[PDB]
From a paper:
[name] is formed by a heteromeric heptamer called coatomer that is recruited to membranes by the guanosine triphosphatase (GTPase) [name] (10, 11). [name] has been shown to recycle escaped ER membrane proteins by binding directly to retrieval signals in their cytoplasmic tails such as K(x)Kxx (where x is any amino acid). Similar findings have been made for the mammalian Vps74 ortholog [name] (18–21). These observations suggest that Vps74 and [name] serve as adaptors to direct the recruitment of glycosyltransferases into [name]-coated vesicles. Here, we determine the structure of the [name] vesicle coat containing [name], an adaptor protein that binds the cytosolic tails of many Golgi residents.
Author numbering:
A (entry chain A): 10 to 25
B (entry chain J): 1 to 311
C (entry chain E): 592 to 824
D (entry chain K): 660 to 710
E (entry chain L): 1 to 146
F (entry chain H): 711 to 953
G (entry chain I): 311 to 499, 536 to 659
H (entry chain N): 450 to 582
The structure:
């Protein structure tokens, strides 16, 4: 059940 | 006991960068080395034992070839070695070899160098083997009358620890230290004698304090702190004594030492719940917070005002 | 394979107590894992016979309700928590003598005073009143004096606590005229009003015990469970 | 957590009989602090010493 | 009011040298020293950390920390003066405040630390007295040898 | 009772019997392993070999022992916990027999499972902070609900008890029998690691009133190990209630 | 200790001297301790000192933590005014000046306080509405602007206040119709855009949904207050024109982001409510919305009391 | 923007499906997890389900009662509006205020309103005077 | 099982005796399971009778294990 | 599929 | 409940003391009170006590003797019923408080002999 999410929100959070 | 459950007075985390010296190499350096090589070999042995290595084969080599040396650095390193080396068999019996070491301690307690006597007395405070202390008692008692304050102050600490752990070796210790305290002039010796009486015989400490109570303001800050500790302990055990000491503690709020002011204010709160006493202690804390520049002091003394407010 | 372990568990599950007892007596059972299994399956009675450790024996004896074995283990352990738990289980079985001993050992004087009241042991209750006096527990001393109906001690306690008004009221209301006069002399007649005594005041006397409880609650000899009768022999 | 249910056998505090100056004997905080620092303080609550 | 231990630690949290002034087990003191680097708060304007059982009082020394472990009820004013005295003793023996020099001079530091604190109580000593006590130069010994 | 923490490691038919007392402290696990020689032979160099899986580190390797015929010894081993992960300790007992050409030099131990629940504490946050953390957290573990429980509330209470997580969703938002429930859960580890869970469960109306609860639990954390270990714990707890 | 609390209450003014320390954690603990020691005897002196400290934070721009300290002072003054309602009249005017601050977090805490105060204290409603109208044009944050619009929409009770709100909303929108005005501006027939027109052109139409709710509340209230049908119909048509011109802007290519379908639905709903003027819609907008706030505030206060009671129980 | 658009589509097309209850769980979960814009769109979608599906109406009324406790002013006002309209149980109100939008030309409406604001009369503005889109 | 299951046979008592790569294990129908013996080589159980496990090794040699 | 997409839509 | 019990006990309202102990779940203490002061109520309290104890330890609950089934285990209980009626008839009225010095303390009273 483990998935890496690659949403725009997760990218923007990681970039912040 | 495992080395982890044993009392540990020293921790040394040196990275053993170089090849750990073989027991045979260490033995050769201790036997045949010069004073420098023996000193470095002894340092390595101490570090290895502190890191959990058992070197029982070196004990007699150190006794024969290092113990009789008169080098001051080796003498001090040997005291650290004797602090950590196992002195008993697994069954708790004293090692036969330790009898030879006991005579060396007796010689060091009689040494012409006052710092060797004082360092040996400080080491004896850590000794837990009554059988090693018993033959040293006459030499330890003779160190109380030594001309140097450095020997006398450490002799008081040795007597205190021997009395605390092995009362049967020195049952007259509270009386001997009371007579020492009355005649002593050195402030450090007086403090150490008074500190022993606080723990061993509070009544003799109170008798001494009663003779000097009006002069406590003129004492050095170290002796004042130990007097405040006695007053706290005595008034905690016996609340009827509070009325006697309030005046002394209030005078100590005006001490020149900020450490004494802090301890006197803390003790005053335990002696009296009266609004005037609490106000005087709280003002002393506020004045300490304002005058002291160190934020560590400010924060910790603020926590004492918070503790006061919880009542 | 040695099937002893799973045959034992299966005999226990199937309630074949004869096979369990035969295995317990004749099979090589190794370690404490089987004792732990017996306890966990609700057969602490069987586990109790194989445990020598006094703490484990005490815990199992309490789970079995075997007060005698729990008492021996509690005497060997001499721990306050063992005495408190033994007291609770002994009370649930009506063994007031062991409850008395547990309350004495735990120094639970208030519960002990209440136990003497409900068992009708007024002589021991009067000893508890003296123990409260010695301990300077003025509240416990007054409470025990209430349980005994002793108005004279109530007046004495109130006088000793400085409650002059209540001491005078109690003495004068209950016809203790000598003590009431002596208290009345201690009132300042210019400043202190003497309380009026209600002439209709009733005596609050505790009821007398009809049948004091000297013996433990009678237990029926329930047929010793199949395990207790057969193992003991 | 401070409101212990008052039991029938608990002491009755008569505030009129207590002297105003009875400071509750706090435990010796220095000795407790030293024992705590050495690790010899059994934590009061969790390790039932009879466990 | 008891100083439990004095230790010299690296900024990485490795204790190089520790001296205990009270009876502590090896496991206890090693545990307390191992907890210290994780408890240290960065960016604060104060140099102490409290746990449930002990207070750490520390002074940064370039790549090192001088750490005192005390009881929570220890006098912070006395402990800070003691910490300043310990921090001044290290440069008297070690030219560089680095792990290697502290390791080479570890016994000289232990001998100096034992002159500052006895049985958890601070001695009334200054840096010049500590130097005199550690040099062990006795006039009586010179006369006796002669 | 110490008995509740005794774990049998070998069988009675093994030449070496072993059982372990597992004591979990806050940062360390103490294994006290009783080792019993069940043979008539002297076991030389009898060594407890331990291996760890997860963020577990063996502090000291157990020393080899010599066991006399039918003799016993206790071997203590300390395992350090570095992070909030599910740990497994594997082991073997290895021995040399003097003179007998016995083909058996190794007894394989039972696996010792370390529970993550000893490291997880219930925590509180606001709904805004929860939604922010839920968007920001990098690791998600999606657990499928597989239980025999038929009540949604009983299943939620069982998950809360089995995970030590706090329900943030108010009781009024969980009230009423509609056959659907959603709840947010929050916990913190003793290491300060945040763990979030969303429970989304339904009662499958088309399977009748005795139908088991169905749905998904999503766990989010900053660390992979935290999300994985919580997910495995929930999967294990759900399977135990299906018995 | 409840026996010592009264002695510390006399020392509150001495404890407040610790606020001279620049450290934020020391200031936070000191303010919390002072707030916990507040009584009817010392609240007035405490509020005067805290007001002076708030005013000092405006003059001392240099410290990095000045904004966080300002937020702490605002929260402390809020809690004092809730406990001692007689002080609220003196505190509110000073706190409302911070709605124009660049620090959105401090302005949000002030707005939450003003919302609670205007609901609990009927005597303060007039003062809060008058002060809110004075500061309304100076509000820089969209969130604070939205909250100020809601307060004005919910609590304006006089005909003069309702006309003043409409005048300030028109001033904040600029020339109407907005699309025609912006096209004329581009044709030549930070450009100091009225704050609301700035927010709409930046694509923040959620403010326009809140404005539509506010305009609906005030228009329905104006119809109840004014007997002249021609003035009623003119004011309702004016409120509808403002909503229609915002919808036209939001669907145009002029804003940086187009209006969302949810904001279109909300503004369209408000237009429909104003066209029908049903008594049910008037009760929902003017009674039920205020009752829902009162129930939310009472529920929060019950949960705080229940949490304190669970800790005390 | 994509979440609100999908919620609007679900509100229009979801109620017309064979099993409309399947979508309500996903829409309602947005009210608990999402930002104010998405919550407002989710409330509007739930109201469209309640207006079209009589079987779902009692469930939607309870869900809208939970949404009235929302901290956001526009989400709460929408939930309050839709709750009160749906509680009336009148199909004409549901069709007028929940399901059916404006049928008039927006540019025509703007121009007609602009003329009416220049020459205001005692007669209210009549939306029927505006050309249909 | 973490280790690969290889073979099994039912005992006359209703116990399932199975082999992994490393162990002979038992399983009871109630879910109780455990280790019986370590295996040096993976073996394929064919029959279990009393204390004797009949098995084939990887060389197809019949072996009897006690 | 669109309902699953809106569960993690950044747009 | 402590003040309630004391206040009922001082009035001689033993039935109210018994019901208070039953309502608070103190069934053993209620049985002791009943046997000592209210022998007529013993069988009622023992039934309630058996029922409650059966939830914790069924064997211990079965071991409790009910005086209605096992009269031989409760010697004097039949005489105690006659004494209970005598105490109710003779001590119905509270004495005036002024007569306290004339009242024999309960410790010296053998109510069974009287």
């Amino acid at each position: 059940g483990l998935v890496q999410r690659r949403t725009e929100a997760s990218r923007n959070a990681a970039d912040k | 006991m495992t080395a982890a459950e044993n009392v540990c007075y020293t921790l040394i985390n040196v990275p053993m960068d170089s090849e750990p010296p073989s027991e045979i190499s260490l033995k050769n350096d201790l036997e045949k080395g010069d004073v420098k090589s023996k000193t470095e070999a002894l340092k390595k042995v101490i570090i290895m034992i502190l890191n959990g290595e058992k070197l029982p084969g070196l004990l007699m080599t150190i006794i024969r070839f290092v113990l009789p040396l008169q080098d001051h650095t080796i003498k001090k390193l040997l005291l650290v070695f004797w602090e950590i080396v196992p002195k008993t068999t697994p069954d708790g019996r004293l090692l036969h070899e330790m009898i030879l070491v006991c005579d060396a301690y007796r010689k060091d307690l009689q040494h012409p160098n006052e710092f060797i006597r004082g360092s040996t007395l400080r080491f004896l405070c850590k000794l837990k083997e009554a059988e090693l202390l018993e033959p040293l008692m006459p030499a330890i008692r003779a160190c109380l009358e030594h001309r140097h304050s450095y020997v006398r102050r450490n002799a008081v600490l040795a007597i205190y620890t021997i009395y605390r752990n092995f009362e049967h070796l020195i049952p007259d210790a509270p009386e001997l230290i009371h007579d020492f305290l009355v005649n002593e002039k050195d402030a450090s010796c007086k403090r150490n004698a008074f500190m022993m009486l606080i723990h061993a015989d509070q009544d003799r400490a109170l008798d001494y304090l009663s003779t000097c109570i009006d002069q406590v303001q003129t004492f050095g800050d170290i002796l004042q702190l130990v007097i405040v500790e006695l007053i706290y302990k005595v008034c905690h055990a016996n609340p009827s004594e509070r009325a006697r000491f309030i005046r002394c503690i209030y005078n100590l709020l005006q001490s020149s030492s900020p450490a004494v002011k802090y301890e006197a204010a803390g003790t005053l709160v335990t002696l009296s719940s009266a609004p005037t006493a609490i106000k005087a202690a709280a003002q002393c804390y506020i004045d300490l917070i304002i005058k002291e520049s160190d934020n560590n002091v400010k924060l910790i003394v603020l926590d004492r005002l918070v503790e006061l407010k919880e009542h | 394979i040695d099937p002893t372990e799973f045959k034992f568990k299966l005999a226990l599950i199937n309630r074949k107590y004869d096979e369990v007892l035969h295995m317990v007596r004749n099979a090589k059972l190794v370690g404490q894992s089987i004792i732990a299994y017996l306890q966990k399956k609700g057969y602490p009675e069987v586990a109790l016979h194989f445990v020598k450790d006094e703490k484990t024996r005490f815990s199992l004896a309490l789970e079995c309700g075997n007060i005698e074995i729990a008492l021996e283990a509690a005497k060997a352990l001499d721990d306050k928590n063992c005495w408190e738990k033994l007291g609770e289980v002994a009370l649930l079985q009506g063994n007031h003598q062991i409850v008395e001993m547990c309350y004495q050992r735990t120094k639970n004087f208030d519960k002990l005073s209440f136990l003497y009241l409900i068992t009708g042991n007024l002589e021991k209750l009067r000893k508890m009143m003296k123990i409260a006096e010695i301990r300077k527990d003025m509240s416990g001393h007054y409470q025990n004096a209430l349980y005994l109906g002793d108005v004279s001690e109530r007046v004495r306690i109130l006088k000793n606590c400085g409650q002059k008004s209540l001491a005078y009221l109690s003495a004068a209301t209950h016809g203790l005229d000598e003590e009431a006069e002596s208290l009345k002399e201690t009132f300042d007649p210019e400043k202190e009003t003497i309380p009026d005594i209600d002439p209709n005041a009733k005596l609050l006397q505790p009821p007398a015990p009809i049948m004091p409880l000297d013996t433990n609650w009678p237990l029926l000899t329930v047929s010793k469970g199949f395990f207790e009768g057969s193992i003991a022999s | 957590k401070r409101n212990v249910t008052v039991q029938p056998d608990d002491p009755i505090s008569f505030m009129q009989l207590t002297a105003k100056n009875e400071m509750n004997c706090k435990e010796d905080q220095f000795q407790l602090s030293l024992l705590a620092a050495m690790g010899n303080t059994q934590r009061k609550e969790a390790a039932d010493p009879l466990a | 009011m008891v100083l439990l231990a004095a230790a010299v630690c690296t900024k990485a949290g490795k204790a190089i040298v520790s001296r205990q002034f009270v009876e502590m087990t090896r496991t206890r003191i090693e545990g307390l020293l191992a907890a210290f680097p994780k408890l240290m708060n960065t960016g604060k304007q104060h140099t102490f950390v409290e746990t449930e059982s002990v207070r750490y009082v520390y002074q940064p020394m370039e790549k090192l920390y001088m750490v005192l472990i005390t009881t929570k009820n220890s006098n912070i004013l006395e402990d800070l003066e003691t910490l300043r005295l310990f921090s001044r003793v290290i440069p008297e023996y070690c030219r560089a405040l680095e792990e290697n020099e502290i390791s080479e001079h570890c016994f000289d530091l232990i001998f100096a630390f034992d002159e500052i604190v006895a049985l958890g109580y601070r001695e009334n000593v200054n840096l010049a007295q500590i130097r005199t006590f550690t040099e062990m130069d006795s006039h009586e010994e010179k006369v006796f040898r002669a | 009772s110490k008995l509740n923490k005794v774990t049998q490691l070998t069988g009675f038919s093994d030449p070496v019997y072993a059982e372990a007392y597992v004591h979990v402290n806050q940062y360390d696990i103490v294994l006290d392993v009783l080792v019993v020689n069940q043979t008539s032979d002297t076991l030389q160099n009898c060594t407890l070999e331990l291996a760890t899986l997860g963020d577990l580190k063996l502090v000291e390797k157990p020393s080899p022992l010599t066991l006399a015929p039918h003799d016993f010894a206790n071997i203590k081993a300390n395992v350090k916990v570095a992070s909030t992960e599910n740990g497994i300790i594997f082991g073997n007992i290895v021995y040399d027999v003097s003179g007998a050409a016995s083909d058996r030099n190794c007894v394989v131990l039972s696996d010792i499972h370390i529970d993550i629940m000893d490291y997880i504490q219930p925590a509180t946050c606001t709904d805004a902070e929860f939604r922010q953390m839920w968007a920001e957290f990098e690791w998600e573990n999606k657990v499928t609900v597989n239980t025999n429980m038929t009540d949604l509330n009983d299943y939620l209470q069982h998950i809360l008890k089995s995970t030590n997580m706090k329900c943030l969703t108010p009781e009024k938002a969980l009230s009423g029998y509609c056959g659907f429930m959603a709840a947010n859960l929050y916990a913190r580890s003793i290491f300060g690691e945040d763990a979030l869970a969303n429970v989304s469960i339904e009662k499958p109306v088309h399977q009748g009133p005795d139908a088991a609860v169905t749905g998904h639990i999503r766990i989010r954390a900053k660390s992979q190990g935290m999300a994985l270990s919580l997910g495995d714990k929930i999967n294990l707890s759900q399977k135990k209630t299906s018995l | 200790h409840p026996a010592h609390e009264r002695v510390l209450q006399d020392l509150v003014m001495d404890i407040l001297r610790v606020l001279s320390t620049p450290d934020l954690e020391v200031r936070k603990k000191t303010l919390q301790l002072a707030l916990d020691l507040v009584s009817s005897r010392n609240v007035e002196e405490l509020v005067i000192v805290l007001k002076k400290e708030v005013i000092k934070t405006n003059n001392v721009s240099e410290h990095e933590d000045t904004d966080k300290y300002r937020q702490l002072l605002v929260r402390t003054l809020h809690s004092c005014s809730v406990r001692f309602p007689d002080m609220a009249a003196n505190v509110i005017p000073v706190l409302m000046e911070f709605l124009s601050d660049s620090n959105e977090a401090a302005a949000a805490d002030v707005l939450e306080f003003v919302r609670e105060a205007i609901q609990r204290f009927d005597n303060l409603r007039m003062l809060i509405v008058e002060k809110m109208l004075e500061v309304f044009h100076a509000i820089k944050s969209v969130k604070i602007y939205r909250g100020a619009l809601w307060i004005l929409g919910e609590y304006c009770s006089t005909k003069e206040d309702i006309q003043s709100v409409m005048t300030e909303v028109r001033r904040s929108l600029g020339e109407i119709p907005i699309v025609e005005s912006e096209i004329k501006k581009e044709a030549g027939e930070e450009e100091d855009r009225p704050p609301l027109r700035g927010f709409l052109l930046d694509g923040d139409f959620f403010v326009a949904a809140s404005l539509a709710t506010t305009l609906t509340k005030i228009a329905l209230r104006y119809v109840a207050l004014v007997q002249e049908k021609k003035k009623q119909n003119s004011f309702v048509a004016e409120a509808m024109l403002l909503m229609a011109t915002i919808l036209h802007l939001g669907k145009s290519s002029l804003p940086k982001k187009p209006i969302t379908d949810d904001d279109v639905d909300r503004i369209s709903l408000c237009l429909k409510v104003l066209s029908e003027c049903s008594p049910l819609m008037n009760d929902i907008f003017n009674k039920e919305c205020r009752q829902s706030l009162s129930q939310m505030l009472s529920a929060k206060l019950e949960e705080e009391k229940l949490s304190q009671k669970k800790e005390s129980e | 923007v994509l979440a609100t658009r999908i919620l609007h589509l679900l509100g229009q097309e979801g109620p017309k499906t064979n099993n409309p209850s399947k979508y309500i769980r996903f829409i309602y979960n947005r009210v608990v997890l999402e930002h104010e814009e998405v919550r407002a769109g989710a409330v509007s979608a739930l109201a469209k389900f309640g207006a079209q599906n009589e079987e779902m109406l009692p469930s939607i009324l309870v869900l809208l009662k939970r949404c009235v406790m929302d901290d956001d002013n526009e989400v709460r006002d929408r939930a309050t509006f839709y709750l009160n309209v749906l509680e009336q149980k009148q199909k004409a109100l549901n069709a007028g205020y929940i399901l059916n939008g404006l049928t008039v030309s927006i540019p025509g409406l703007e121009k007609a309103l602009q003329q009416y604001t220049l020459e205001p009369s005692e007669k209210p503005f009549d939306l029927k005077s505006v050309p249909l889109a | 099982e973490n280790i690969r299951v290889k073979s099994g046979a039912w005992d006359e008592s209703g116990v399932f005796i199975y082999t992994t790569s490393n162990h002979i294990k038992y399983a009871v129908t109630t879910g109780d399971h455990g280790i019986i013996r370590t295996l040096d080589l993976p073996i394929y159980v064919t029959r279990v009778k009393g204390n004797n496990v009949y098995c084939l090794d990887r060389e197809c040699r019949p072996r009897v294990l006690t | 599929h669109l309902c699953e997409f809106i569960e993690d839509c950044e747009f | 409940n402590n003040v309630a019990f004391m206040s009922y006990f001082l009035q001689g309202k033993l039935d109210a003391c018994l019901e208070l102990l039953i309502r608070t779940g103190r069934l053993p203490e209620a049985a002791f009170l009943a046997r000592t002061y209210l022998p007529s109520q013993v069988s009622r309290v023992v039934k309630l006590w058996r029922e409650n104890l059966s939830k914790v330890n069924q064997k211990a609950a079965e071991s409790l003797a009910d005086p209605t089934e096992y009269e031989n285990l409760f010697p004097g209980l039949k005489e105690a019923f006659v004494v209970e009626e005598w105490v109710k008839e003779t001590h119905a009225d509270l004495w005036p408080a002024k007569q306290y010095p004339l009242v024999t303390p309960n410790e010296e009273r053998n109510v069974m002999e009287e």
